[PDB]
Amino acid sequence: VKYWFCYGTKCYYFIMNKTTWSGCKANCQHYSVPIVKIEDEDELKFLQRHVIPEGYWIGLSYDKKKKEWAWIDNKFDMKFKSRGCVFLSKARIEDTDCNIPYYCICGKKLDKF
């Protein structure tokens, strides 16, 4: 199951194939669309409100060449840090292992129509 949907000026790809975080990139990158990047409250909530009650990955992960966390691509929204990767739920986002099987949410930005 891999439907897509658009809200505001962005479209999303909700892969429903519970794999380790590094699974989105793989899919998403393959589906030529970056893994999601929750850019604002308006959005963040949209995904939860939209999304089906479950563990959803997002582009936020931990880097070593940086003590911080970041989206594959750099945002108007912010951060407790440790390590791992973050999942998005209908309740809130939150971290943990990237090797834990989950669902994706890629998302491309729109520039036209």
Place this chain on the structure above:
Amino acid sequence: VKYWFCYGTKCYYFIMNKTTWSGCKANCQHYSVPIVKIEDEDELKFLQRHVIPEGYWIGLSYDKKKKEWAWIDNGPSKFDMKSRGCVFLSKARIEDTDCNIPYYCICGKKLDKFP
């Protein structure tokens, strides 16, 4: 004012230039998107709720080669709920009357991809 948005697989355009219904014809075509065609409530509401409180046109209108009302084609439309003219959209509902009235447009294309 001409901003756009996308809900579901459809992207819209909301023109803020109060003109005659035959105005979208011009505007939307000018923007390469059909005047909007409200396929259903899920969508309809989204337009009403999302749309700012105002009279907004929609692809629905009284045709010649018919006695009926159409948009561009024919879809999971149904409501022959209320004679002639054109129909506007308000945060409350849709409704008919003259097309020569200074209103706003809602162009709305469909999508087939993502890009």
